[PDB]
């Protein structure tokens, strides 16, 4: 309604650096296409963009400009389609419905197999269906609902994300799409082949919960270290088994509960000795000595047995096994430190210029205004889109300069540790004093 | 405690936490990431459910448990999926060696001996050394974060 309000909303400003290392302020109109940028995509980019070797996110932010433009174009195209857009807007609802259905199906299977808010209402309806129709019909209905809801969720996911915008190859390469396809296949298997396949769907908890994902990362980050420690444990077990087979063959007597003698020799062969050690010594707190024949102090090999058991216990149980847990704790610490560093950087430094919030103290302009009005990464994206959408025939000085810098793949036009609102005022003031 | 039953006085011992700040910080070291601990427990439950399904499908006869009947001494603890899940979730988690510490001892001549060995080893590595230790790792991480803050 208000022309001034409309122009203020559709007008943006940025700061650039020219070839002579001089800072200039450019005021431009926001292209209409820029209005179709999703807040989810903006947040994802802001929280995922990484720093380069020089500590700048500008390289990645610029490299994502084409993807952002294509995503905005796809969103504009989709918004003309009401039904598909409406379905795409409810991805969270579809995912929640699918997860609840999977949980209910798994609970029913656990509590009844073998056989033959609105959540309380859903539970009551499920109980009534079980009482009236039966477990089988209830499971069939739940499986059909889960399959339909997952199909709707996949349609919504593709529509909203525009993964096809990068091509079918990119969509296939995407891990999330493959995960959704595998989930659909698992649901189909549960519905038709055997209901027990529904148990696999419980792994969707990891996908849904980020905290559990971080906990799992604490183990998977140093998975190579864990596997190497396990291999070292296996080598030590092999050596101990060799020693036992050479000198303690008769002490490997194991009780057995034969199905319709009660003891057997478990070290007649090297492979059997290795298997017995690797299993029992590792699964017993006291080590291999907890299953070997109990010796007597009068035996000549009693000191040897004591030394063997003690060495196994100290070397394998207290050290080797605890190394995996130590690696897990170290990974926990490293993840926490990295996350804290990243959050501190993101919250106390400027995305474009990288200046800290401590140069802006005691000045007309604060960090908040500097990030909302002067170095807006989104305003830079809008300027990039304008340069790419504007006919070359009506470029201005700075528009042509930025277009040429883009043609040459040069980022030196983004400011870096410099702000027109920070040092330009004092610089002009000292210049006036000098003059 | 004064009127209904004197045993209610035991609840008053929780005032120690209120009185002592150090114990309160120790409890905070666990309660700060309570959601993480609960999610880890749910993951453990899901893994136990999968292992119980596998055992019921292929190792039904090996779930024999001794019982001290009040005035046969063994019973089958995996005749149903729910019973198998309960037995695993209890014994495997409360035994250092895992679920294998309560299953029937096999013989090397049995055709399923390698399968039993693999099952027990997988349960031990996946659930006992990793999943259970994740809660303790979370507690240690919370300790470190609290001290740093
Ligand atoms: C006993 C042994 C047999 C049963 C266990 C065997 C198999 C079933 C495994 C199902 C695992 C479910 C894990 C996720 C879950 O728990 O999601 C509950 C969902 C609601 O999801 P939401 O979107 O609100 O998730 C919000 C946050 N999130 C995801 C952390 C809850 O459904 C609900 O609430 C419905 C819950 C109804 C009550 C069922 C109680 C027992 C089974 C499962 C619940 C979890 C374990 C409880 C403790 C069991 C101790 C033995
Ligand atoms: C637990 C995983 C799901 C297992 C599952 O639904 O079993 C389904 C069938 C069970 O019927 P049955 O043939 O035994 O007897 C026929 C019919 N009855 C059992 C009533 C006698 O099993 C079979 O087909 C038995 C032979 C194949 C079993 C493996 C099925 C494929 C595995 C899928 C998931 C594997 C990954 C596990 C999670 C970790 C991921 C990293
Ligand atoms: C339900 C199970 C369905 C069947 C899955 C197996 C079939 C084969 C699939 C091939 C692809 C497997 C790898 C997929 C990696 C996907 C990825 O890159 O995401 C990893 C995600 C974590 O999700 P996030 O934290 O990145 O997003 C969370 C955002 N929120 C919270 C808004 C939802 O974890 C995950 O998929 C963890 C999945 C663990 C699967 C275990 C084996 C089954
Ligand atoms: C471990 C103990 C097992 C616990 C039960 C849960 C099993 C499922 C584990 C899912 C792991 C997963 O979702 O991945 C976690 C990390 C992701 O790391 P990031 O945040 O840097 O990924 C950046 C990209 N973003 C975030 C989009 C993915 O994975 C990686 O990096 C490397 C993943 C290597 C694959 C093995 C992970 C450990 C589990 C093995 C047993 C089989 C599980 C079946 C699924 C295997 C494929 C996942
Ligand atoms: C912790 C670090 C890890 C491992 C080191 C463990 C060392 C264990 C030593 C066991 C010694 C033992 O249990 O022996 C006690 C026996 C019992 O005497 P009795 O009165 O029942 O028998 C009458 C015989 N009468 C009169 C001579 C006593 O008497 C004896 O010492 C009998 C004579 C034993 C002579 C051979 C000793 C070999 C032991 C250790 C050397 C290797 C150390 C390797 C470190 C790496
Ligand atoms: C040692 C033999 C190993 C036995 C079992 C495996 C490992 C035992 C614990 C680690 C020992 C170790 O790597 O030692 C290293 C020390 C170094 O010390 P440094 O002052 O030169 O500093 C130099 C600093 N740097 C190393 C950075 C240059 O070497 C020394 O001098 C220590 C010399 C000790 C010689 C007698 C060894 C008797 C073995 C006892 C085993 C007890 C194990 C108990 C716990 C585990 C079993 C469950
Ligand atoms: C331990 C908690 C206090 C329990 C307590 O004082 O029991 C009192 C009564 C005991 O008499 P009785 O009826 O068994 O036999 C009648 C008389 N006689 C026992 C001599 C045969 O118990 C009863 O009323 C028995 C039935 C109710 C028991 C639960 C009492 C209410 C629970 C309160 C605290 C719960 C939280 C525990 C701390 C964790 C907080 C997070
Ligand atoms: C004696 C028990 C009496 C019955 C209690 C249960 C009845 C239900 C109560 C509803 C409220 C429960 C939550 C209260 C939170 C209070 C709060 O906000 O304080 C948390 C305090 C820690 O006290 P602080 O370090 O903040 O102050 C210390 C300052 N100084 C050292 C000078 C004294 O811990 C606490 O109450 C921990 C209390 C733990 C109760 C367990 C369940 C019983
Ligand atoms: C855990 C293992 C159990 C150990 C036995 C002791 C049970 C009593 C635990 C008392 C916990 C408590 O006093 O709270 C600790 C934290 C407080 O955190 P903050 O310093 O940021 O609080 C800022 C405000 N300020 C300081 C004034 C409260 O609580 C929170 O934040 C979240 C508290 C969530 C409630 C569950 C806590 C864990 C225990 C569960 C079993 C049932 C205990 C009954 C009492 C439940 C209510 C407390
Ligand atoms: C640590 C990582 C976690 C798990 C991996 C554990 C692998 C356990 C391997 C057990 C192997 C075992 O205990 O076997 C030893 C038996 C005993 O031989 P005997 O002289 O008493 O019997 C006479 C028969 N004669 C002449 C052929 C020897 O002989 C044999 O190997 C008999 C032939 C066995 C063939 C099937 C082997 C399946 C095992 C593993 C593959 C899956 C690995 C999954 C990893 C994830
Ligand atoms: C793996 C299957 C899982 C088995 C049991 C559960 C988890 C075992 C330990 C964690 C394994 C894990 O997440 O691995 C991850 C490694 C990654 O290493 P990367 O060099 O690519 O670094 C890439 C760095 N990132 C991940 C940040 C992108 O994946 C790899 O490449 C490792 C490829 C290894 C393939 C053979 C797997 C045989 C399984 C052995 C289980 C032994 C467990 C012993 C202890 C637990 C049982 C009590
Ligand atoms: N250069 C930057 N440095 C730090 N944070 C930034 C930067 N540019 C943007 N942000 C933050 O990223 C988010 C994007 O701000 P944006 O102007 O898009 O907000 P908005 O409220 O959605 O917009 P508007 O109200 O102007 O229509 C905000 O949190 C903003 O503070
Ligand atoms: Zn800036």
Short mmCIF file of N, CA and C in Angstrom, two decimals, chain A residues 20-129:
data_model
loop_
_atom_site.label_atom_id
_atom_site.label_comp_id
_atom_site.label_asym_id
_atom_site.label_seq_id
_atom_site.Cartn_x
_atom_site.Cartn_y
_atom_site.Cartn_z
N UNK A 20 41.04 -1.06 -7.35
CA UNK A 20 41.95 -0.20 -6.61
C UNK A 20 41.85 -0.37 -5.10
N UNK A 21 41.29 -1.49 -4.64
CA UNK A 21 41.16 -1.77 -3.21
C UNK A 21 40.37 -0.67 -2.51
N UNK A 22 39.33 -0.18 -3.18
CA UNK A 22 38.44 0.84 -2.63
C UNK A 22 37.06 0.24 -2.43
N UNK A 23 36.45 0.55 -1.28
CA UNK A 23 35.13 0.02 -0.95
C UNK A 23 34.04 0.96 -1.45
N UNK A 24 33.02 0.37 -2.07
CA UNK A 24 31.88 1.11 -2.58
C UNK A 24 30.59 0.44 -2.13
N UNK A 25 29.54 1.25 -1.98
CA UNK A 25 28.22 0.78 -1.58
C UNK A 25 27.30 0.82 -2.79
N UNK A 26 26.64 -0.31 -3.06
CA UNK A 26 25.78 -0.47 -4.22
C UNK A 26 24.36 -0.73 -3.74
N UNK A 27 23.42 0.09 -4.19
CA UNK A 27 22.00 -0.05 -3.88
C UNK A 27 21.30 -0.51 -5.14
N UNK A 28 20.58 -1.62 -5.05
CA UNK A 28 19.96 -2.25 -6.21
C UNK A 28 18.57 -2.73 -5.84
N UNK A 29 17.70 -2.90 -6.84
CA UNK A 29 16.38 -3.49 -6.57
C UNK A 29 16.44 -5.00 -6.52
N UNK A 30 15.65 -5.58 -5.62
CA UNK A 30 15.65 -7.03 -5.44
C UNK A 30 14.85 -7.67 -6.58
N UNK A 31 15.43 -8.61 -7.33
CA UNK A 31 14.65 -9.30 -8.36
C UNK A 31 13.46 -10.04 -7.76
N UNK A 32 12.37 -10.09 -8.53
CA UNK A 32 11.18 -10.76 -8.05
C UNK A 32 11.41 -12.24 -7.79
N UNK A 33 12.25 -12.88 -8.61
CA UNK A 33 12.51 -14.30 -8.44
C UNK A 33 13.12 -14.59 -7.08
N UNK A 34 13.85 -13.63 -6.52
CA UNK A 34 14.49 -13.83 -5.22
C UNK A 34 13.48 -14.06 -4.11
N UNK A 35 12.22 -13.68 -4.31
CA UNK A 35 11.20 -13.84 -3.28
C UNK A 35 10.84 -15.30 -3.03
N UNK A 36 11.27 -16.22 -3.89
CA UNK A 36 10.90 -17.63 -3.79
C UNK A 36 12.01 -18.48 -3.17
N UNK A 37 12.76 -17.92 -2.22
CA UNK A 37 13.81 -18.64 -1.52
C UNK A 37 13.26 -19.18 -0.21
N UNK A 38 13.48 -20.47 0.04
CA UNK A 38 12.91 -21.12 1.21
C UNK A 38 13.75 -20.86 2.45
N UNK A 39 13.06 -20.59 3.56
CA UNK A 39 13.74 -20.38 4.83
C UNK A 39 14.50 -21.62 5.27
N UNK A 40 13.96 -22.81 4.99
CA UNK A 40 14.66 -24.03 5.34
C UNK A 40 15.99 -24.12 4.60
N UNK A 41 15.98 -23.83 3.30
CA UNK A 41 17.22 -23.84 2.53
C UNK A 41 18.19 -22.78 3.04
N UNK A 42 17.68 -21.59 3.36
CA UNK A 42 18.55 -20.53 3.88
C UNK A 42 19.22 -20.97 5.17
N UNK A 43 18.44 -21.53 6.10
CA UNK A 43 19.01 -21.98 7.37
C UNK A 43 20.01 -23.11 7.16
N UNK A 44 19.68 -24.06 6.28
CA UNK A 44 20.60 -25.16 6.01
C UNK A 44 21.93 -24.64 5.47
N UNK A 45 21.87 -23.73 4.50
CA UNK A 45 23.10 -23.18 3.94
C UNK A 45 23.89 -22.42 5.00
N UNK A 46 23.21 -21.60 5.80
CA UNK A 46 23.90 -20.80 6.80
C UNK A 46 24.59 -21.69 7.84
N UNK A 47 23.93 -22.77 8.26
CA UNK A 47 24.47 -23.63 9.30
C UNK A 47 25.39 -24.72 8.77
N UNK A 48 25.46 -24.92 7.45
CA UNK A 48 26.29 -25.97 6.88
C UNK A 48 27.50 -25.46 6.12
N UNK A 49 27.48 -24.22 5.64
CA UNK A 49 28.62 -23.71 4.89
C UNK A 49 29.88 -23.76 5.74
N UNK A 50 30.96 -24.27 5.15
CA UNK A 50 32.22 -24.48 5.85
C UNK A 50 33.25 -23.45 5.41
N UNK A 51 34.27 -23.28 6.25
CA UNK A 51 35.38 -22.39 5.95
C UNK A 51 36.42 -23.09 5.09
N UNK A 52 37.10 -22.31 4.26
CA UNK A 52 38.16 -22.82 3.40
C UNK A 52 39.48 -22.77 4.16
N UNK A 53 40.59 -23.02 3.46
CA UNK A 53 41.89 -22.97 4.11
C UNK A 53 42.21 -21.58 4.62
N UNK A 54 41.67 -20.54 3.97
CA UNK A 54 41.89 -19.16 4.38
C UNK A 54 40.89 -18.69 5.42
N UNK A 55 39.92 -19.52 5.81
CA UNK A 55 38.95 -19.13 6.81
C UNK A 55 37.78 -18.33 6.29
N UNK A 56 37.44 -18.47 5.01
CA UNK A 56 36.33 -17.74 4.40
C UNK A 56 35.31 -18.72 3.83
N UNK A 57 34.04 -18.41 4.04
CA UNK A 57 32.93 -19.18 3.50
C UNK A 57 32.43 -18.64 2.17
N UNK A 58 33.05 -17.57 1.67
CA UNK A 58 32.59 -16.93 0.45
C UNK A 58 32.69 -17.87 -0.74
N UNK A 59 33.74 -18.69 -0.80
CA UNK A 59 33.90 -19.61 -1.92
C UNK A 59 32.70 -20.55 -2.03
N UNK A 60 32.36 -21.23 -0.93
CA UNK A 60 31.23 -22.15 -0.95
C UNK A 60 29.92 -21.40 -1.18
N UNK A 61 29.75 -20.24 -0.55
CA UNK A 61 28.51 -19.49 -0.72
C UNK A 61 28.30 -19.12 -2.18
N UNK A 62 29.36 -18.68 -2.86
CA UNK A 62 29.25 -18.34 -4.28
C UNK A 62 29.03 -19.59 -5.13
N UNK A 63 29.72 -20.68 -4.81
CA UNK A 63 29.55 -21.91 -5.58
C UNK A 63 28.12 -22.43 -5.48
N UNK A 64 27.43 -22.13 -4.39
CA UNK A 64 26.04 -22.55 -4.22
C UNK A 64 25.05 -21.58 -4.85
N UNK A 65 25.52 -20.51 -5.49
CA UNK A 65 24.60 -19.51 -6.03
C UNK A 65 23.74 -20.08 -7.15
N UNK A 66 24.34 -20.87 -8.05
CA UNK A 66 23.57 -21.46 -9.14
C UNK A 66 22.51 -22.41 -8.60
N UNK A 67 22.87 -23.23 -7.61
CA UNK A 67 21.90 -24.13 -7.01
C UNK A 67 20.77 -23.35 -6.35
N UNK A 68 21.10 -22.26 -5.66
CA UNK A 68 20.06 -21.45 -5.03
C UNK A 68 19.12 -20.85 -6.07
N UNK A 69 19.67 -20.34 -7.18
CA UNK A 69 18.83 -19.78 -8.23
C UNK A 69 17.92 -20.83 -8.83
N UNK A 70 18.46 -22.02 -9.10
CA UNK A 70 17.63 -23.10 -9.64
C UNK A 70 16.55 -23.51 -8.66
N UNK A 71 16.88 -23.56 -7.37
CA UNK A 71 15.89 -23.91 -6.36
C UNK A 71 14.78 -22.87 -6.29
N UNK A 72 15.13 -21.59 -6.38
CA UNK A 72 14.11 -20.55 -6.38
C UNK A 72 13.22 -20.65 -7.61
N UNK A 73 13.82 -20.93 -8.77
CA UNK A 73 13.02 -21.11 -9.98
C UNK A 73 12.07 -22.29 -9.83
N UNK A 74 12.55 -23.40 -9.27
CA UNK A 74 11.70 -24.56 -9.07
C UNK A 74 10.58 -24.27 -8.09
N UNK A 75 10.88 -23.52 -7.02
CA UNK A 75 9.83 -23.16 -6.07
C UNK A 75 8.77 -22.29 -6.72
N UNK A 76 9.19 -21.33 -7.54
CA UNK A 76 8.23 -20.50 -8.26
C UNK A 76 7.36 -21.36 -9.17
N UNK A 77 7.97 -22.30 -9.89
CA UNK A 77 7.20 -23.17 -10.77
C UNK A 77 6.23 -24.03 -9.98
N UNK A 78 6.67 -24.57 -8.84
CA UNK A 78 5.82 -25.44 -8.04
C UNK A 78 4.64 -24.68 -7.45
N UNK A 79 4.86 -23.44 -7.01
CA UNK A 79 3.80 -22.69 -6.35
C UNK A 79 2.59 -22.50 -7.25
N UNK A 80 2.76 -22.61 -8.57
CA UNK A 80 1.62 -22.57 -9.47
C UNK A 80 0.78 -23.83 -9.38
N UNK A 81 1.29 -24.89 -8.76
CA UNK A 81 0.57 -26.14 -8.62
C UNK A 81 0.10 -26.28 -7.18
N UNK A 82 -1.20 -26.09 -6.89
CA UNK A 82 -1.65 -26.10 -5.48
C UNK A 82 -1.51 -27.45 -4.80
N UNK A 83 -2.02 -28.50 -5.44
CA UNK A 83 -2.10 -29.80 -4.79
C UNK A 83 -0.71 -30.31 -4.40
N UNK A 84 0.22 -30.31 -5.36
CA UNK A 84 1.56 -30.82 -5.08
C UNK A 84 2.26 -29.95 -4.04
N UNK A 85 2.08 -28.63 -4.14
CA UNK A 85 2.66 -27.73 -3.14
C UNK A 85 2.07 -28.00 -1.76
N UNK A 86 0.76 -28.21 -1.68
CA UNK A 86 0.12 -28.50 -0.40
C UNK A 86 0.67 -29.79 0.19
N UNK A 87 0.82 -30.83 -0.64
CA UNK A 87 1.40 -32.08 -0.14
C UNK A 87 2.84 -31.88 0.31
N UNK A 88 3.62 -31.10 -0.44
CA UNK A 88 5.02 -30.88 -0.09
C UNK A 88 5.16 -30.10 1.22
N UNK A 89 4.18 -29.25 1.54
CA UNK A 89 4.29 -28.45 2.75
C UNK A 89 4.15 -29.26 4.04
N UNK A 90 3.78 -30.54 3.97
CA UNK A 90 3.49 -31.34 5.15
C UNK A 90 4.46 -32.52 5.27
N UNK A 91 5.73 -32.30 4.94
CA UNK A 91 6.73 -33.35 5.08
C UNK A 91 6.86 -33.80 6.53
N UNK A 92 6.87 -32.84 7.47
CA UNK A 92 6.98 -33.19 8.88
C UNK A 92 5.80 -34.04 9.32
N UNK A 93 4.59 -33.67 8.90
CA UNK A 93 3.41 -34.45 9.26
C UNK A 93 3.50 -35.87 8.70
N UNK A 94 3.90 -36.00 7.43
CA UNK A 94 4.00 -37.33 6.83
C UNK A 94 5.04 -38.17 7.56
N UNK A 95 6.20 -37.58 7.87
CA UNK A 95 7.23 -38.33 8.57
C UNK A 95 6.79 -38.76 9.95
N UNK A 96 6.12 -37.87 10.68
CA UNK A 96 5.62 -38.22 12.01
C UNK A 96 4.60 -39.35 11.92
N UNK A 97 3.69 -39.28 10.95
CA UNK A 97 2.70 -40.34 10.79
C UNK A 97 3.38 -41.67 10.50
N UNK A 98 4.36 -41.66 9.59
CA UNK A 98 5.05 -42.89 9.24
C UNK A 98 5.78 -43.47 10.45
N UNK A 99 6.47 -42.62 11.22
CA UNK A 99 7.20 -43.11 12.38
C UNK A 99 6.26 -43.68 13.43
N UNK A 100 5.14 -42.99 13.69
CA UNK A 100 4.18 -43.50 14.67
C UNK A 100 3.60 -44.83 14.22
N UNK A 101 3.26 -44.95 12.93
CA UNK A 101 2.73 -46.21 12.43
C UNK A 101 3.75 -47.33 12.58
N UNK A 102 5.01 -47.06 12.25
CA UNK A 102 6.04 -48.09 12.38
C UNK A 102 6.21 -48.51 13.84
N UNK A 103 6.22 -47.54 14.76
CA UNK A 103 6.38 -47.86 16.17
C UNK A 103 5.21 -48.71 16.66
N UNK A 104 3.99 -48.33 16.29
CA UNK A 104 2.82 -49.11 16.72
C UNK A 104 2.86 -50.52 16.15
N UNK A 105 3.23 -50.66 14.87
CA UNK A 105 3.30 -51.98 14.26
C UNK A 105 4.33 -52.84 14.98
N UNK A 106 5.50 -52.27 15.26
CA UNK A 106 6.55 -53.03 15.93
C UNK A 106 6.14 -53.42 17.34
N UNK A 107 5.47 -52.51 18.06
CA UNK A 107 5.00 -52.83 19.41
C UNK A 107 3.99 -53.97 19.36
N UNK A 108 3.05 -53.91 18.42
CA UNK A 108 2.05 -54.97 18.30
C UNK A 108 2.72 -56.30 17.99
N UNK A 109 3.68 -56.29 17.06
CA UNK A 109 4.38 -57.53 16.72
C UNK A 109 5.11 -58.08 17.94
N UNK A 110 5.79 -57.21 18.69
CA UNK A 110 6.53 -57.66 19.86
C UNK A 110 5.60 -58.25 20.91
N UNK A 111 4.45 -57.62 21.14
CA UNK A 111 3.56 -58.03 22.22
C UNK A 111 2.57 -59.12 21.82
N UNK A 112 2.48 -59.48 20.54
CA UNK A 112 1.49 -60.48 20.13
C UNK A 112 2.08 -61.59 19.28
N UNK A 113 3.16 -61.31 18.56
CA UNK A 113 3.74 -62.32 17.69
C UNK A 113 4.33 -63.46 18.53
N UNK A 114 4.09 -64.72 18.16
CA UNK A 114 3.25 -65.20 17.05
C UNK A 114 1.77 -65.13 17.38
N UNK A 115 0.91 -64.96 16.37
CA UNK A 115 -0.53 -64.88 16.56
C UNK A 115 -1.22 -65.86 15.63
N UNK A 116 -2.29 -66.48 16.12
CA UNK A 116 -3.03 -67.47 15.35
C UNK A 116 -2.11 -68.59 14.88
N UNK A 117 -3.72 -34.52 23.12
CA UNK A 117 -3.14 -34.91 21.84
C UNK A 117 -4.00 -35.99 21.17
N UNK A 118 -3.67 -36.29 19.91
CA UNK A 118 -4.40 -37.31 19.17
C UNK A 118 -3.78 -38.69 19.31
N UNK A 119 -2.59 -38.79 19.91
CA UNK A 119 -1.97 -40.10 20.10
C UNK A 119 -2.79 -41.02 21.00
N UNK A 120 -3.33 -40.57 22.14
CA UNK A 120 -4.21 -41.47 22.91
C UNK A 120 -5.41 -41.95 22.12
N UNK A 121 -6.00 -41.08 21.30
CA UNK A 121 -7.12 -41.49 20.47
C UNK A 121 -6.69 -42.53 19.44
N UNK A 122 -5.52 -42.35 18.84
CA UNK A 122 -5.01 -43.32 17.89
C UNK A 122 -4.78 -44.66 18.57
N UNK A 123 -4.22 -44.64 19.78
CA UNK A 123 -3.99 -45.88 20.52
C UNK A 123 -5.31 -46.57 20.83
N UNK A 124 -6.32 -45.79 21.24
CA UNK A 124 -7.63 -46.37 21.52
C UNK A 124 -8.24 -46.99 20.27
N UNK A 125 -8.11 -46.30 19.13
CA UNK A 125 -8.63 -46.85 17.88
C UNK A 125 -7.91 -48.14 17.51
N UNK A 126 -6.59 -48.18 17.70
CA UNK A 126 -5.84 -49.40 17.40
C UNK A 126 -6.29 -50.54 18.29
N UNK A 127 -6.48 -50.26 19.58
CA UNK A 127 -6.95 -51.30 20.50
C UNK A 127 -8.33 -51.80 20.11
N UNK A 128 -9.23 -50.88 19.75
CA UNK A 128 -10.57 -51.29 19.32
C UNK A 128 -10.50 -52.15 18.06
N UNK A 129 -9.66 -51.76 17.11
CA UNK A 129 -9.51 -52.54 15.89
C UNK A 129 -8.98 -53.94 16.19
#
